[PDB]
Design an enzyme around this catalytic site. Structure first.
Site, PDB file in Angstrom:
ATOM      1  CB  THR A  83      -0.917  -0.008   1.221  1.00  0.00           C
ATOM      2  OG1 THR A  83      -0.145  -0.380   2.364  1.00  0.00           O
ATOM      3  CG2 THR A  83      -2.067  -0.995   1.055  1.00  0.00           C
ATOM      4  CG  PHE A 107      -5.698   5.191   5.843  1.00  0.00           C
ATOM      5  CD1 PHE A 107      -4.578   4.398   5.673  1.00  0.00           C
ATOM      6  CD2 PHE A 107      -5.637   6.513   5.442  1.00  0.00           C
ATOM      7  CE1 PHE A 107      -3.405   4.921   5.128  1.00  0.00           C
ATOM      8  CE2 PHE A 107      -4.472   7.039   4.905  1.00  0.00           C
ATOM      9  CZ  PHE A 107      -3.359   6.244   4.750  1.00  0.00           C
ATOM     10  CB  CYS A 119      -5.239   1.643   8.066  1.00  0.00           C
ATOM     11  SG  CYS A 119      -3.437   1.437   7.884  1.00  0.00           S
TER      12      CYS A 119
END
Ligand code: HEM
EC number: 1.14.14.1
Length: 453
Positions: free
Chosen positions: A266, A391, A398
């Site tokens: 990512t 996120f 996240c």
């Protein structure tokens, strides 16, 4: 109200639509023609893809929906275990690890990881400083070297030394093959077929490579007693305030594997997409370069200096708006409920949040949604709730968001300080899809501004 559905393949329903190199991009095109929601069926499986802020605002209601493990992450779980990313919210080890790890991932904790992020960033800069005139840069390849090594250093004080090699460290090689094997099982019609029996031997070998290395460093650290600035130290010293218990050595191993899977691809993709948008938008690059030069007045960037790179932070958010590198997340209904006042769902019904389409909702962003304009983020309080979700959502968002953004701002800041960039091939965007998105084949030439570090 009946729900749109893309074209069907007889008894395979919609499943052959995902038998392609670029599933997310195909799903985005389906969303273009069908709208904010569409049913997607497969043999013994049904999900609904959401693209509009109005519906995703409801899907992010944690009282009504919880994180679901897609079939991809069920396969990844075979080596990520019950680490944070591949565990259910109701699993004892999710909450425990979440409570233990959360303080080590705060914005404040980035002060502790800063020096080791700079260590790998300086290696990247010096590599580019040392290229000869004819040579060019393979952007995703080098960004991935940096993010793997940064997560290695800050995660468990291990140096993969990715800038010293052409073939990566065997762990990195085994992890990428494992992720690749987990991905290929998604479109694999015949289980147990002997053509993949070697794929299984390689899989078990790759799991053992990963487990052997991580278990040995944990064991070595326990015997050593050394205190470092890494996540492994915090995990060995941490106790869950709720249960009072620490994480056992096995789950600690799954957490380390998880950080590397969840973080390296990512963050690599974000830096690559960001640099791509900058070279395609020279006025934005100049504005960001002007900030880098103004703020990073010392040979080595400081933690406070990285926090002042505001426009660089806006560039990163606009790159994440257009190409969120973890592009979809899955949810399930906790109880019977009605979505958007017109779609009844039964307990357990699955939803998919298609982040790239959410980020193109013209009713949120206006009509120029395909343009790269970081100034969209000059006043973040104007953005409606749940319109920008690179996120994820809620307690299942996240945990590495602050780590990812601090690294990316640091690295892109130093890149813009030290080099002018040339799009020497007139690169045409080609987005490769693993479980993550990245620009494939993106290359640039860097001319050093000859500033010492
Ligand atoms: C740079 C861009 C990054 C993006 C776009 C990203 C994206 C995401 C998303 C969308 C989720 C939610 C997944 C879901 O709902 O199923 C997630 C979760 C997670 N991410 Fe990140 N990530 C990034 C970097 C990182 C880094 C650097 C780390 C660790 C060092 C990390 C570790 C994790 C973990 C452990 C979870 C699971 C959290 C939980 O469920 O308790 N990610 N990430």
């Amino acid at each position: 109200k009946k729900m749109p559905q893309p074209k069907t393949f007889g008894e395979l329903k919609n499943l052959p639509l995902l038998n392609t190199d670029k599933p997310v991009q195909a799903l985005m095109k389906i969303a273009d023609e069908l709208g904010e929601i569409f049913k997607f069926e497969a043999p013994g499986r049904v999900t609904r893809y959401l693209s509009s802020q109005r519906l995703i605002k409801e899907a992010c209601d944690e009282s009504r929906f919880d994180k679901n493990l897609s079939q991809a992450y069920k396969f990844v779980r075979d080596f990520a275990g019950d680490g944070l990313g591949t565990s259910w919210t109701h699993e004892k080890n999710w909450k425990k690890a979440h409570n233990i790890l959360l303080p080590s991932f705060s914005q404040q904790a980035m002060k502790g990881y800063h020096a080791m992020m700079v260590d790998i960033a300086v290696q990247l800069v010096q590599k580019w400083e040392r290229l000869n005139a004819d040579e060019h840069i393979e952007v995703p390849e080098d960004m991935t070297r940096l993010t793997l090594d940064t997560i290695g250093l800050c995660g468990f004080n291990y140096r993969f030394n990715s800038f010293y090699r052409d073939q990566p460290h065997p762990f990195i090689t085994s992890m990428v093959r494992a992720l690749d094997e987990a991905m290929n099982k998604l479109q694999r019609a015949n289980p147990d077929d002997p053509a993949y029996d070697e794929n299984k031997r390689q899989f078990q070998e790759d799991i053992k490579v990963m487990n052997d290395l991580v278990d040995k460093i944990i064991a070595d650290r326990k015997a050593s007693g050394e205190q470092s600035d890494d996540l492994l130290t915090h995990m060995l010293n941490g106790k869950d305030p709720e249960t009072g218990e620490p994480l056992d050595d096995e789950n600690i191993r799954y957490q380390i594997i998880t950080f590397l899977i969840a973080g390296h691809e990512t963050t690599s993709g974000l830096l690559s997409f960001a640099l791509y948008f900058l070279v395609k938008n020279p006025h934005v690059l100049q504005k960001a370069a002007e900030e880098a030069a103004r703020v990073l007045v010392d040979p080595v960037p400081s933690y406070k200096q990285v926090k002042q790179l505001k426009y660089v932070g806006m560039v990163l958010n606009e790159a994440l708006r257009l190409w969120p590198t973890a592009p979809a997340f899955s949810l399930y209904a906790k109880e019977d409920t009605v979505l958007g006042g017109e779609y009844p769902l039964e307990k357990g019904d699955e939803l998919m949040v298609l982040i790239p389409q959410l980020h193109r909702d013209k009713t949120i962003w206006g009509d120029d949604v395909e343009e790269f304009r970081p100034e969209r983020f000059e006043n973040p309080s104007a953005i409606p709730q749940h319109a920008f979700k690179p996120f994820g959502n809620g307690q299942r968002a996240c945990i590495g968001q602050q780590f990812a953004l601090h690294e990316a701002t640091l690295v892109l800041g130093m890149m813009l300080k030290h080099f002018d960039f040339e799009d020497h091939t007139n690169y045409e965007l080609d987005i490769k899809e693993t479980l993550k998105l990245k620009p494939e084949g993106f290359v640039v030439k860097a001319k050093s501004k000859k500033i010492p570090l």
